[PDB]
Amino acid sequence: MICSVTGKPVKDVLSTFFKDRNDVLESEVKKFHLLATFEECKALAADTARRMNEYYKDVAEPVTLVALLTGAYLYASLLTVHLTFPYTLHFVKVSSYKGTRQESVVFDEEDLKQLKEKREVVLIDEYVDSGHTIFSIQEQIKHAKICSCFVKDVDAIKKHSALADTKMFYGYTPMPKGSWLIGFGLDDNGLRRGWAHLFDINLSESEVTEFRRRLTEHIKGLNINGVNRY
Amino acid sequence: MICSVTGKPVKDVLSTFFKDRNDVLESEVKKFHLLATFEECKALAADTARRMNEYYKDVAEPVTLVALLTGAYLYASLLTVHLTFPYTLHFVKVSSYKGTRQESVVFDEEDLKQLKEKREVVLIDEYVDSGHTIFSIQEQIKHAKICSCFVKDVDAIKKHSALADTKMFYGYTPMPKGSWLIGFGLDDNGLRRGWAHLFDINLSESEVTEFRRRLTEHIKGLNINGVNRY
Ligand SMILES: Nc1nc2c([C@@H]3N[C@H](COP(=O)(O)O)[C@@H](O)[C@H]3O)c[nH]c2c(=O)[nH]1
Numbered sequence: 001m002i003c004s005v006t007g008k009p010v011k012d013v014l015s016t017f018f019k020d021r022n023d024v025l026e027s028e029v030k031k032f033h034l035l036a037t038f039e040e041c042k043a044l045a046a047d048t049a050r051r052m053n054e055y056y057k058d059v060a061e062p063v064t065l066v067a068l069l070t071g072a073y074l075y076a077s078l079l080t081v082h083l084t085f086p087y088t089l090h091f092v093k094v095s096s097y098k099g100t101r102q103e104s105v106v107f108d109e110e111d112l113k114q115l116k117e118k119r120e121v122v123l124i125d126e127y128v129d130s131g132h133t134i135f136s137i138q139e140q141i142k143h144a145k146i147c148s149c150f151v152k153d154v155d156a157i158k159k160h161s162a163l164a165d166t167k168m169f170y171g172y173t174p175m176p177k178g179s180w181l182i183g184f185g186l187d188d189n190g191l192r193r194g195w196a197h198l199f200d201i202n203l204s205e206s207e208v209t210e211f212r213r214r215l216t217e218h219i220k221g222l223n224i225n226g227v228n229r230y
Numbered sequence: 231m232i233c234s235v236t237g238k239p240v241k242d243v244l245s246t247f248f249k250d251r252n253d254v255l256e257s258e259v260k261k262f263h264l265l266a267t268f269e270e271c272k273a274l275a276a277d278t279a280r281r282m283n284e285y286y287k288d289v290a291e292p293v294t295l296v297a298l299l300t301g302a303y304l305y306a307s308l309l310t311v312h313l314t315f316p317y318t319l320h321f322v323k324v325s326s327y328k329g330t331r332q333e334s335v336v337f338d339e340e341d342l343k344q345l346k347e348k349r350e351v352v353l354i355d356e357y358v359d360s361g362h363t364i365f366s367i368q369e370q371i372k373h374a375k376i377c378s379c380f381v382k383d384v385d386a387i388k389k390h391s392a393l394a395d396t397k398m399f400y401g402y403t404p405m406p407k408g409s410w411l412i413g414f415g416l417d418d419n420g421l422r423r424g425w426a427h428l429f430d431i432n433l434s435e436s437e438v439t440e441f442r443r444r445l446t447e448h449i450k451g452l453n454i455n456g457v458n459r460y
Pocket residue numbers: 071125126127128129130131132133134179180181182186187188
């Protein structure tokens with residue numbers, strides 16, 4: 001029931017968060033269940049930056065980092081500020097096409113052409129849920145690597161032979177089945193992307209408590225001293 | 231000589247920033263002149279959030295925020311997390327077309343159609359310099375408002391009758407004549423966007439010292455204690 005980074009009780013994090021806002025009705029506040037505080041998310045992103053930094057410390061050409069609009073902007077901002085190897089960064093807009101046999105990510109022809117040319121290309125997304133998105137991107141850019149703050153089920157992803165070899169840098173896994181997340185850049189029907197904490201609106205209290213129990217112990221065991229230079 | 235937010239000697243902020251990096255050579259470190267620490271930039275962004283929050287406290291419909299790729303991703307992340315009114319967020323990767331008579335911003339037909347329909351549209355940019363970008367967007371979306379962390383010369387921008395009425399929210403102005411900024415999302419020829427502190431690579435030590443004196447004066451008089459809820 002306490003933030004694993006600051007030590008502030010979640011009730012206090014939320015009392016501060018919800019004080020006199022103009023973007024949520026008092027009656028709606030209870031609908032939002034905090035899964036991870038913004039500070040906890042920042043720790044996860046820093047830990048991910050740490051691993052990418054170690055991986056690319058000797059790279060001889062800038063890495064191509066590419067983030068998918070729009071939600072990943074926040075995570076990308078929390079990740080990139082801690083990276084210490086050369087890279088370029090750009091964002092691309094893709095559309096999800098739900099076919100009768102599979103869901104596919106449709107890129108701008110030019111964007112895709114450019115990416116397929118780079119040796120080191122890392123797709124940044126804040127959340128890998130069903131994995132259909134990265135599964136599609138993967139089959140279009142076979143050498144692409146993935147960097148995601150949250151991954152619902154890594155094992156499920158690795159089950160696919162196509163992704164079994166793909167390098168993935170992620171902050172935390174697994175995420176609760178039956179959840180629906182908003183905040184941390186993810187929209188609530190277009191709104192609240194800037195609600196920095198990661199909230200859920202579909203889980204039971206017990207499920208939220210269990211998720212935090214596991215997240216908290218994971219964060220307390222992290223060693224990211226020095227990663228943040230600011 | 232110190233960060234106007236943390237009180238830490240800039241010399242130490244920089245030594246911490248540059249210790250064991252893999253994205254700059256030792257001989258190149260002196261090329262970067264610190265203009266504003268990441269913390270100072272965060273204070274300026276919080277101030278713009280505070281002002282936007284007051285302006286839109288009674289908005290009846292979601293405000294349309296449009297951030298200009300690529301550089302605005304960091305500032306947008308630092309601004310949106312503190313906004314307390316409803317809004318949607320979109321990034322536009324418009325293309326700059328340098329004509330023989332003027333430079334114009336080319337939008338995706340659909341993106342432009344959508345924006346021109348919304349009553350409240352705010353363009354988010356980390357830095358408005360020559361102003362050609364917003365000047366173009368302005369004549370295409372005449373009702374667009376601007377929210378920029380840094381502005382080279384506000385006085386100069388208002389010189390244009392077309393922009394003389396455009397509502398502008400900004401963190402700080404003016405920026406040093408002849409400066410070239412990198413960091414805080416701005417690229418150094420594609421690289422270093424994640425260097426969160428705002429650096430310049432053209433100014434003399436005395437020019438930089440003078441800029442920080444003025445920035446310091448502004449930040450110390452800043453009233454944002456409370457804007458950050460995280
Ligand atoms: N608001 C909110 N968005 C998503 C998404 C959106 N779909 C993207 C890719 O999903 P997937 O892995 O299922 O293909 C995510 O990166 C995210 O932007 C998945 N799950 C959720 C969720 O619970 N909440």
